């Protein structure tokens, strides 16, 4: 259970959580309600594990891509903004928070990666990925390196993998097809091979993570990095003379970065949905609210039309929207967490030389497709299990699930998740239909 008359917010560690807490202080000064902001590790995975048992934050912040899975699991309260509030945010930002025709979260800002470069080490940054090896050889001579970015998260290496034809799923006829997956194609292979070749040629180390790349660029050791708006405030602190520009092209095609919409969703198990709505609509989604988060770690291109009119003057936001128009919006389908686990595995294995590009991507394509196919089976099984009212079959199912041990009894319900059950136990449930 979640405490009443108190709001608890969860947001990622790379976002402006101290600035968000400053907005919670204004909320407390005007209403009396205490607001507590937390930034757990792996919060995208913690939220489904705690919100199922009625615990967790009242508000959760993440990009839109994970919200579809939370909505299908019944974890999110359906937000109902009045017509006049909806006109304050850009229409395409509300589309990213729409699942099954319902609005499941409040859009906050649009993010996309950009090429961030150091003007004192490299005033003319490369326009192509292919000229980075020669540039690195020229920079190493001067005691520096060309490029360093997070190689541990597929979000960062995706601009290059999608450049020549890679894609998450086909969005054929206004609906994503979980069968058509563009990870094994020749465009994705061409992209990831280029990346692996940079590492084999010592132009990059496969062990580079977020922190290593952040410190090397901010200390002046590397000429370029690939990061989002949230990173700008730390670069300012380092006093590095930096620019934010277009991501380089690969095989004449532009790098296609994933575009995410930072969203705030209200937990369905929370008794503070009234306070959460008041906080998000009248405190956070205002020029003053967004400015407090943006001053901590930049949001990018905010969803609020009035505050975006001020930020549009910023050439770093122009670079962000330039890269965002060239990339792809993140799909919001519930098997996106399985898609991400697959691409993350293939990228790391190929980068480290543990698998070839063709082998790594074939396994990713195979797993993403299989995990999505099985999840749709579970969604059809769930729809039929809720239409079931025959107390006889319900008792037989309650008994089969009792044998497995995969269940929990609450004051009013007998709970169990179809995802937690063995693929064998699911086949038994089909026989009951």
């Amino acid at each position: 259970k979640i405490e009443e008359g108190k709001l608890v917010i969860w947001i990622n560690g790379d976002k402006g959580y101290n600035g968000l807490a400053e907005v919670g202080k204004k909320f407390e000064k005007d209403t009396g309600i205490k607001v507590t902001v937390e930034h757990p590790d792996k919060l995208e995975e913690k939220f489904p594990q705690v919100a199922a048992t009625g615990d967790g934050p009242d508000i959760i912040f993440w990009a839109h891509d994970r919200f579809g899975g939370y909505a299908q699991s019944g974890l999110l309260a359906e937000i109902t903004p009045d017509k006049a509030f909806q006109d304050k945010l850009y229409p395409f930002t509300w589309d990213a928070v729409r699942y099954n025709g319902k609005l499941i979260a409040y859009p906050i800002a649009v993010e996309a990666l950009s090429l961030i470069y150091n003007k004192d080490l490299l005033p003319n940054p490369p326009k192509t990925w292919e000229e980075i090896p020669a540039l690195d050889k020229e920079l190493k001579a001067k005691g520096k390196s060309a490029l360093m970015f997070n190689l541990q998260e597929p979000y960062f290496t995706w601009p290059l993998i999608a450049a020549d034809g890679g894609y998450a799923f086909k969005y054929e006829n206004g609906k994503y097809d979980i069968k058509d997956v563009g990870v094994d194609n020749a465009g994705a292979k061409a992209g990831l091979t280029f990346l692996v070749d940079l590492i084999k040629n010592k132009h990059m180390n496969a062990d580079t993570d977020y922190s290593i790349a952040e410190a090397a660029f901010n200390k002046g050791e590397t000429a370029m990095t690939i990061n989002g708006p949230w990173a700008w405030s730390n670069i300012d602190t380092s006093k590095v003379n930096y620019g934010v520009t277009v991501l380089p092209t690969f095989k004449g095609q532009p790098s296609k970065p994933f575009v995410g919409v930072l969203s705030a969703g209200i937990n369905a198990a929370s008794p503070n949905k009234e306070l959460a709505k008041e906080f998000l609509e009248n405190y956070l989604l205002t020029d003053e609210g967004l400015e407090a988060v943006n001053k901590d770690k930049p949001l990018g291109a905010v969803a609020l039309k009035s505050y975006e009119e001020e930020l549009a003057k910023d050439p770093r936001i122009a670079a962000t929207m330039e890269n965002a128009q060239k990339g792809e919006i993140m799909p919001n389908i519930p098997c996106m967490s399985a898609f991400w686990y697959a691409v993350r595995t293939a990228v790391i294995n190929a980068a480290s030389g543990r698998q070839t590009v063709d082998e790594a991507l074939k396994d990713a394509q195979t797993a993403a497709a299989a995990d999505c196919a099985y999840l749709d089976e579970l969604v059809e099984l769930h729809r039929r299990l809720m239409t079931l009212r025959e107390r006889h079959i319900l008792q037989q199912i309650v008994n089969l699930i009792e044998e497995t041990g995969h269940f929990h009894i609450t004051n009013t319900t007998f709970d169990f998740d179809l995802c937690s059950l063995d693929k064998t136990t699911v086949r038994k449930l089909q026989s009951y239909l």
């Binding site: 199922a52 699991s73 019944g74 769930h382 299990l385 809720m386 319900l394 199912i397 309650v398 009013t412 319900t413 007998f414 709970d415 169990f416 998740d417 179809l418």
Partner: peptide
Amino acid sequence: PVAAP
């Protein structure tokens, strides 16, 4: 997530 009365 399945819940049963």
